[PDB]
Symmetry: D3
Subunit: 256 residues, 6 copies
């Protein structure tokens, strides 16, 4: 198994003792994802990518963070929706910080944080800095962290054209849209009912944000773009591209 949770402490110890062990931590959320998809998408997707990447490069995957930061209107619909269960920034930051501290204690020195929930980014960044700060007090400067949101690896114009023959709309509105829905159709079809997709024009907003969040400014379904054209085929493409790209990136930053 490539999952730390499924290993005995002895097996884990031996792997870290190897010296070049790479650990991966998926960071997701419990968030509404329209009428056609379930709410644990942000955990399921990066976890599936982590598993596949780990199998290829000989890495290990830590239990994923199930709850993430508050959903923002322009990227995830808004934290006013039912189901969405978000943590305060301090809580998410502290969780990341605590995990890094513990991994360093084990003797680990290579960590990849794979974000699957757009809004988590800056709090992950702060948790990393606080953990690295503490390691520095002990004179430790060899703990290295690579942070990434898996969708950023789908850049190849050729790939983008296949997935979006009519044009890429941007990652900000890819919440419950073609990208996430296609991956889900390929990985967990039973958790997706494309027939329930509520077609609507791609969400647009003015150059600013308003709080309290105005529910009227988010498409009724909660999605920011339609997944009507999502498909298992597109999902298989996205999956291979991400796994390959991320596997290469990790081998690059954490070589033998």
């Amino acid at each position: 198994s490539v999952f730390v949770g499924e290993l005995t402490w002895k097996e884990y110890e031996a792997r870290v003792a190897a010296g070049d062990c790479v650990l991966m931590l998926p960071v997701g959320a419990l968030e509404q994802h329209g009428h056609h998809m379930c709410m644990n998408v942000d955990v399921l997707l990066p976890t599936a990518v982590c598993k596949r990447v780990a199998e290829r490069i000989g890495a290990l995957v830590m239990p994923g963070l199930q709850y993430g930061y508050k959903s923002q209107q322009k990227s995830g619909g808004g934290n006013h929706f039912p189901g969405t269960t978000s943590l305060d920034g301090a809580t998410l930051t502290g969780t990341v910080q605590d995990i890094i501290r513990e991994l360093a204690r084990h003797g680990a020195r290579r960590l990849v944080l794979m974000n699957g929930h757009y809004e988590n980014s800056m709090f992950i960044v702060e948790g990393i800095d606080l953990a690295l700060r503490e390691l520095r007090y002990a004179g430790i400067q060899d703990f290295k962290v690579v942070v990434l949101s898996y969708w950023d690896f789908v850049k190849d114009p050729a790939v983008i054209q296949q997935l979006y023959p009519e044009g890429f709309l941007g990652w900000d509105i890819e919440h419950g849209g073609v990208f996430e829905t296609s991956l889900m159709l390929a990985l967990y079809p039973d958790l997706v009912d494309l027939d329930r997709v509520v077609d609507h024009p791609p969400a647009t907003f003015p150059p600013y944000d308003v709080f309290p969040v105005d529910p009227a400014r988010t498409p009724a379904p909660g999605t920011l773009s339609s997944a009507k054209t999502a498909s298992r085929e597109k999902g298989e493409l996205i999956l291979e591209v991400c796994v390959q790209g991320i596997a290469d990136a990790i081998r690059e930053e954490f070589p033998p």
Copy 2:
């Protein structure tokens, strides 16, 4: 599905709209469990129990807390072991607090926290208190919480007698022993290898604790008792007793 993460936000909203929806939250840890068992035991077990109880009483299960409080020598071997990845008390407390705040926002008013890691108890307690304190600030006083550790429902003398024809020696030393190992053999046999069990005598300690934790005071394998006599059958019985007992307790506290 009985898992909130596998529902759409509309399906979840509908269940809460019913008025008497009971939500369940498993709280575990990533911790060493000897040479014969994996490290996510404390998440897997309460989650499996929650699932079965939820199926029986029509409740829903929230994503579980994967990381818990620091392992203590007398109950989990100690936080010095590799693999064990623990959170600070404030972090765990804050996580529980944030989740309750969000569930209340959804309109939910009935929550069952099922602890699977001994050491989490008091921090779960503080998280609950802080969240209820805030709810009262908003005039909300109808949010009710039931907290329990699933093993406390295995107290019937006849059951203990059948499970331990030699004698029960308390839940304290039941870390990686007969109880947890038997449950795992019944639910996830592939994650257990009885041939690797180190059959040492029950762990004993003086009436006080020492910090920094002294490794010599914990049996080398990390277990506090031998799981040599663990069996699938013992696990099936434990599972039956726990599910029935918790289901009855929840119906009592959260009637239709």
Copy 3:
């Protein structure tokens, strides 16, 4: 000379720590209801009295005690809904323990005994200790050693237990305001106990789970979890000698001269 740090001059304290093997003791209690027959500072008074006697025997020093502890829980203290009980949030207690260890380490002390007298304090004392040791480690300090214990855990001799609990040991959690604490109080501070006000009720029992908000009905009306009807000075004196002796021996073993 006094065994209490508070009654020493800084020069005397400094000299004792300069010795090199000085052991410090910190009582951790609470302000909590203890039925109709006993006062509310029991959890401070008792561990403080034990520390004093242990200190006198092994040559240790006792720090001012923590007067307020963690929230009373229904199954071990009656519940935090009772009047009088004044509790701190976990972070507050944890931080207090953390600050004190930091300061003792600054003084040059390296041996500390935390003696808990309020059941609910345990885990927050543990977190306070971990956070303080973590910070000491940042400065390369790994020789600070801590021994934490709840004084009642030393009362284990089958023979002594039989006298206190003729019908069986009820468990340290439901001992709140019962025979154990009341007997000690009768022996140490009789003026603060009125055995005639004891409301005799059966030992408190609870289901295998807890409910919040706490339900007042599931706690005996007087606030006690077990009856102190049979409490006596004699039982108190026995408990006292057993604790002092056992704790003194434990400290001598962990912190040898």
Copy 4:
């Protein structure tokens, strides 16, 4: 009359809020390196200058700006390893925003515009707002409204973008110490810019991931993420008018008189 709260007496401020529809604006910046050609308080100076001009047009008031912001990130500000850059922890910035909102609500104010000038501040400003609104709700207050924006987002007109970047727009992320900010500075504070010191390097490019500890080698030597060689006072005046007009209109829309 001044549009800055700091330059008013408390009586004058009180009267303005008593008006009932008073709009307050808070500039949120940072002290951060901005290449060899510009000073380090750019992120405070620019949003404050924009706030002043917007306030003059719509009759709003401007609060003292936040001088220190969140840690500079490699992909958007060069990195927090540079000298001069003085950053706050996320909790500190969030708490500052939170405290100010709480206080303004106490004054009776209910309309606030937070104008961010430092790319990295965004999410911590967002958390500060959420925590403050949460507290207001506890006190039964639900009419406090907040508008948050990063001023450069108002430069949307394809015609304006083309004038600034005739060879193509490469994004706001690498617009640190580049054409955009440098042009505005040339138009507002020319004495604080030495265009002759601009190190004309190719625009910064990074792989689809982040690495920590930040690797200095992955940031252009000067600290800038794009060359300001083509910056000019003319471009600056266009940007200024575009931002002021757009924001003024947005506020009139969200906070009608």
Copy 5:
């Protein structure tokens, strides 16, 4: 009938609060070095003794005192570099005060007097009060009132001052371990004072600024900021009567029956 809450049963306490105009008093001290002639728990002992006497006269109740206070400052307590002195971080002290007020309010109490005995505690007590009142407001509670004071501020009469300091008033800040505190201790706890060990140095003087890390050389070697050579039980009795009467009167005025 004891005036200490800790020595009451929860029923007795409940009955007192039920009165409707009950006044609670909380001593806030510290564990701090006090020269070669006095013990280190002075800051707790003195305000507690004053609270007890005031309570007896006005029918109030006294809560367990805070044993540890904020970090000793050079100009008012000698400095936190001294052995023995065991200080809390500001957040810890503030949080302790906050938790206590929250609980007292839960009991139904609405009148609290915080009597400070350690100079440096003041602003953290103030913050704890503000945060507690803020929370009470969220709960719709606005009738909780707090009076905070440092007992020495009540010694104002010129005649009294001259009797105490024939050479001239030195200011309450340098009155650390000097005539004022030592005299009170001589009148209240003579066994904890050895006037023969007093080091008769001239009053400490400092430039108009502070330096950190604290420089030990800038504090008189004994730790005292002024000489207690002329301290006496007679002066102690005078101070005690002035403080008790003045405070009793002030409380009667702020918390009328």
Copy 6:
């Protein structure tokens, strides 16, 4: 060359720190009501102006000032109940000071002067400094030195006081919006002062204790604690010269070039 860090390039800043003896100065103020005759940013403007002049004379650099300070207290600033005054919680201010010191240390700086302009900030500045020095100690760094001062403490010469107050000085406590601050403002920013609006009331006096919630009636209606009727540009110029000279000499003493 500017003495303000914000107006320097990171290269210029780096070079100055490289000198190995660079002194950094941080103004710490507040946004607070200052009567009917003066604006609310006084506490930022004054220490910043003093820092600028001192820096010009001794070759130091000035950091962006803290614009918001701790909650106004009745006896020193009128009270936090006034409109306009926008205060931070203690933890927020302490955290801001702490974060800035961490960053300056990272830059390689080791000499810092914090110039307080708001009475109430003092203890939180102190705690921020302690927490920062504590963390530096975790990294084996103990050569970072901090000097903290409130600029008005340098106006102590009897001859100067006599010239400024030919009718008698009554202390710094009541100098909120009075002669001292108003005179400085008249000399530095005359347009922000309108002496004709001064409410000439008698000096504020208070009992030896404080009450919370704060009672508005106990503060002079205008918000000032003493009348600035006799304030003048001349008095302001004198105060400025004395403060700048005194502070410059103190800094040279503590941080020799």
